[PDB]
């Protein structure tokens, strides 16, 4: 325990293994330590470390934070096998600047800390507004189809779908920089909605199961096609494909023959339960030497995040549709929802990613809250709401308290 | 001997260890100095730390 071995990082990237005194204060070692790395660099034939103007030599963690000069290496949380970085930090001292006249003073100062609008951002705003505009247009046209079977909805939406996709193609080919790509992607993605309702609205007669088969089908196809030729925005497109696919299976079954919705909902729930365990494998198979490894790593990470999101959306819709405050053993789905939530609530810890872990943890909480709301709207009476309100506030309070306390 | 003698005057315990081995001078990285060569042969000058 009298000494510790650690890796020290030096100029341009050489790592050197050294056995340091575990109890002397850190300020005592930086100078001779610098000599040793320079000696090895000089014998190795590399360029030694050098000072520049005014500054000092400091020893920091790989995060960059310097260690307190007066404390012992054992007094700090540094263990054998860790690594450190030796660095030069320049002097920041300079004269102070004053401006008397408050009008000029406020103008000069305020222009430094905040960013003004520019022509690059101006385009992304317009691009976002056009996307919002068409998703509203499809909404009113779709609402009209719900009361009328005439071709108008498909006729007018079809032309919009063609126009938005046409414009998107030119932007994609003309692109030059990351900013240009962002604008192009936002525009193309906006084409999926008008095209989707354009097909689903074509089959005559009242709306329902028969039209549903077309809608979720063309939707899944378009999302997959965009992902293939674009190869960007992986996570969101992946989510659309999953939710679209599972809905198409349910739509086709209900359209062909189904004894009850409960049967379909129960089937979907079981499919999702097994899908959670397959998700990491699916994500993993879906994916100068350094480029291949990092590309593989980030591509893989993205697919899992999207895959988890798709499953989370389906279970809450299915689960909340299965439970009921009046039908039979009212308590059976309530406790079943609890057991189903427990698995998700506990398993979230197995993944290192922050957003992946948070989405899993969040998926369980929303189901419990949603179930209570359903049981509060229907079977409405002072006892029902009084119980639900107390439950909803105590529920998360206990969860955070158990973790923080 | 003089270091242990001085340590006792400071009230600190003398240098002591157990097991097969030996006592020697080392650099900040733990590398021991050469036992058969002069400090003038090695790169040692006034104010160095060991």
């Amino acid at each position: 325990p009298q000494a510790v071995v650690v890796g020290v990082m030096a100029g341009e990237g050489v790592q050197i293994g050294v056995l340091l005194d575990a109890n002397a204060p850190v300020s005592v070692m930086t100078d001779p330590l610098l000599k040793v790395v320079n000696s090895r660099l000089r014998e190795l034939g590399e360029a030694p470390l050098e000072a520049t103007g005014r500054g000092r030599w400091a020893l920091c963690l790989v995060d960059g934070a310097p260690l307190r000069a007066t404390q012992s290496l054992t007094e700090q949380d540094v263990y054998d096998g860790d690594r450190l970085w030796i660095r030069f930090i320049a002097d920041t001292e300079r004269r102070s600047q004053v401006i008397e006249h408050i009008s000029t003073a406020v103008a000069s100062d305020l222009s430094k800390r905040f960013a003004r609008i520019d022509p690059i951002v101006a385009v992304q705003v317009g691009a976002s507004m056009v996307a919002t505009g068409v998703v509203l247009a499809t909404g009113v046209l779709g609402w009209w189809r719900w009361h009328h079977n005439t071709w108008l909805t498909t006729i007018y939406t079809a032309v919009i779908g063609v126009l938005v996709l046409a414009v998107a193609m030119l932007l994609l080919m003309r692109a030059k920089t990351d900013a240009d790509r962002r604008v192009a992607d936002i525009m193309l993605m906006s084409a999926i909605m008008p095209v989707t309702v354009a097909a689903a609205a074509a089959p005559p007669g009242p709306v329902g199961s028969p039209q549903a088969v077309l809608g979720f089908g063309v939707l899944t196809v378009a999302a997959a096609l965009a992902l293939r030729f674009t190869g960007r925005r992986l996570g969101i497109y992946t989510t659309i494909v999953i939710i679209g696919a599972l809905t198409m299976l349910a739509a086709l079954a209900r359209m062909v023959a189904a004894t009850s919705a409960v049967t379909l909902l129960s089937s979907l729930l079981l499919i999702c339960v097994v899908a959670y365990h397959a998700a990491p494998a699916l994500s993993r198979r879906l994916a100068s030497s350094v480029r291949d490894v990092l590309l593989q790593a980030e591509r893989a990470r993205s697919f899992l995040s999207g895959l988890l999101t798709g499953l989370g959306v389906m279970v809450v819709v299915c689960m909340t549709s299965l439970c009921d405050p009046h039908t039979g053993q009212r308590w059976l789905p309530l406790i079943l929802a609890g057991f189903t939530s427990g698995f998700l609530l506990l398993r979230g810890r197995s993944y290192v990613d922050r957003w992946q872990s948070i989405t899993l943890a969040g998926t369980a909480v929303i189901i419990a809250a949603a179930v209570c709301v359903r049981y509060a709207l229907e079977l409405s009476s002072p006892l029902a709401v009084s119980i639900v309100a107390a439950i909803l506030v105590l529920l998360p309070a206990a969860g955070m308290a158990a973790a923080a306390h | 001997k003089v270091v242990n003698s001085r340590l006792r005057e400071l009230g600190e315990a003398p240098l002591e260890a157990t097991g097969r081995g030996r006592w020697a001078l080392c650099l900040v990285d733990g590398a021991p100095l050469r036992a058969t060569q002069s400090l003038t042969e090695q790169d040692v000058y006034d104010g160095d730390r060991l």
Partner: peptide, 18 residues
């Protein structure tokens, strides 16, 4: 400056001569 800082600087300076 502290006593430690003074001796640290003094040791660095002690290495050189005309």
């Amino acid at each position: 400056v502290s006593i430690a800082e003074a001796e640290e600087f003094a040791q660095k300076l002690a290495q050189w001569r005309l």
